[PDB]
Amino acid sequence: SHMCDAFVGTWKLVSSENFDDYMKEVGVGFATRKVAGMAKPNMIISVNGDVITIKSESTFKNTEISFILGQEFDEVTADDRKVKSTITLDGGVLVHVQKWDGKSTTIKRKREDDKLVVECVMKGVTSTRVYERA
Numbered sequence: 004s005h006m007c008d009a010f011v012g013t014w015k016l017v018s019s020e021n022f023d024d025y026m027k028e029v030g031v032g033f034a035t036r037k038v039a040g041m042a043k044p045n046m047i048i049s050v051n052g053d054v055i056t057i058k059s060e061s062t063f064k065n066t067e068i069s070f071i072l073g074q075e076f077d078e079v080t081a082d083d084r085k086v087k088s089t090i091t092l093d094g095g096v097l098v099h100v101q102k103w104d105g106k107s108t109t110i111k112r113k114r115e116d117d118k119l120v121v122e123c124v125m126k127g128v129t130s131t132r133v134y135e136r137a
């Protein structure tokens with residue numbers, strides 16, 4: 004009974020494009036890129052009241068964030084950046100901005116057909132990651 008309803012569930016990665024290049028742009032080192040690029044995460048999204056939780060589970064790392072839309076939080080990313088994050092809903096798209104060391108990257112999550120599409124942008128580099136229901 005909220006529009007973020009269509010994100011809720013357990014999702015499995017089914018394709019990735021340009022993710023190594025995105026990770027290079029973000030500053031991820033060689034060994035982490037190689038192992039992280041191999042991961043096939045499940046993304047688990049849940050909502051309880053105003054609090055959204057997004058978990059990523061893979062053989063590389065298990066991560067979890069919980070947040071309220073529009074309210075900044077500190078996040079330690081899977082690649083160990085300490086970032087300040089804000090996630091908003093913009094026309095039905097979850098828009099996640101991470102700020103650190105004068106840099107910024109944006110991760111958009113959207114429902115498209117039966118998929119959850121994740122678009123990650125750092126400067127001119129975009130990666131697209133497609134998830135299906137698990």
Ligand SMILES: O=C1NC(=O)[C@@]2(C=C(c3ccc(O)cc3)SCC2)S1
Pocket residue numbers: 026031035036039059080081082110121123132
């Ligand atoms: O599919 C996705 N789900 C996520 O949470 C993303 C993963 C990231 C990442 C993970 C591990 C790593 O070593 C370096 C970056 S940053 C972009 C957002 S893409």
